[PDB]
């Protein structure tokens, strides 16, 4: 059906303990350690808190786990476990549980996050460059280690702009990468979810995180944030068809014998494939290059299969100027 270019037997060759999550049995540490000093979030499955590690003074955040799954908890668990030491992956410093309740929470390396919204429309050339060639490090090494992030947007990037640090966060959709497997394809959010998941295709891979770091790249050198601002799933796919276009949507849907909702029959109308240069505009032209609209063009593809592994990302002229520095 669909097979990942890369990484496809990582999982397979490896010990059945480190992808059989639902066998994982983590140590739980004590809780009390920590004293909570503010809210930093909340998602439907937790609640993140900035938090100070009492017995030794260390800042820390706390990710306290809610209507969680058991199995979902034991799941984001052990890939983190499968990730540590991995470049810009946040760093899990320890799993504990309040000692009475018995509730989990995860203990994460504090990061003095810059606020996204404003920071991408002040970066430069080069800044746009630098994070995403340290965040596609970040989505190498998972794909390397057998795991889809799945939920890759900037609410998930962590970046400290004044000590230029990058930290991919919330690892709560990830999965581990198995060939020919059909995942679930409500995952990532919808600005940032690849037309395969719009479009109801189950066997994706990797290559999904690409299309999401494409979205992030393309609001960064057009900023406009976000670049597809669909109002619903449909309409998230209508504005991807109006930039690919419409006849090269149906040919990457016959390549996979992908059945199209009918209800798209009435609202993706005819449109050609735009040139990417139609985003340039006074306030963003020096953001954009040749190079950056080339690697564009090579991630923003419907075919999740032809898109940009990360490492061939990182590989492109683009980032030259990075790996010089
Ligand atoms: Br983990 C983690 N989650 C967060 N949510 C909001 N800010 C956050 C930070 Br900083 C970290 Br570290």
Redesign the pocket.
């Known amino acids: 059906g669909s097979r990942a270019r890369v990484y496809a037997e990582v999982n397979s060759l490896r010990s059945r303990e480190y992808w059989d999550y639902e066998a994982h049995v983590p140590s739980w540490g004590n809780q009390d350690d920590y004293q909570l000093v503010r809210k930093?979030?909340r998602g439907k499955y937790s609640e993140?808190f900035e938090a100070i590690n009492i017995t030794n003074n260390e800042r820390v955040?706390v990710?306290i786990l809610k209507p969680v799954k058991k199995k979902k908890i034991k799941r984001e668990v052990k890939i983190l476990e499968n990730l540590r030491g991995g470049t810009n992956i946040?760093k899990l410093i320890d799993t504990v549980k309040d000692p009475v309740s018995k509730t989990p929470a995860l203990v994460?390396?504090?990061?003095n996050?810059t606020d996204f919204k404003q920071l991408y429309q002040i970066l430069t050339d080069f800044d746009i460059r630098f994070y995403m060639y340290e965040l596609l490090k970040a989505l190498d090494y998972c794909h390397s280690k057998g795991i889809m992030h799945r939920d890759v947007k900037p609410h998930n990037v962590?970046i400290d702009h004044q000590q230029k640090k990058l930290?991919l966060?919330?690892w709560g959709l990830a999965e581990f990468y198995h060939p020919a497997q059909e995942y679930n394809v409500r995952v990532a959010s919808r600005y940032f979810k690849g037309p395969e998941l719009l479009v109801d295709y189950q066997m994706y891979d990797y290559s999904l995180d690409m299309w999401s770091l494409g979205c992030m790249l393309a609001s960064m050198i057009f900023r406009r944030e976000p670049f597809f601002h669909g109002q619903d799933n449909y309409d998230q796919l209508v504005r991807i068809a109006k930039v690919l276009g419409t006849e090269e949507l149906y040919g990457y849907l016959k390549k996979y014998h992908i059945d199209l909702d009918p209800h798209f029959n009435d609202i993706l109308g005819q449109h050609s494939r735009k040139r990417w240069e139609n985003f340039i505009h006074s306030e963003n032209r020096h953001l954009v290059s040749p190079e950056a609209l080339d690697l564009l063009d090579k991630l923003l593809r419907y075919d999740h299969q032809q898109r940009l592994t990360a490492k061939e990302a990182m590989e492109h002229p683009y980032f030259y100027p990075v790996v010089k520095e």
């Open positions: 930093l979030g993140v955040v990710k946040i994460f390396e504090y990061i996050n962590m930290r966060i919330d």
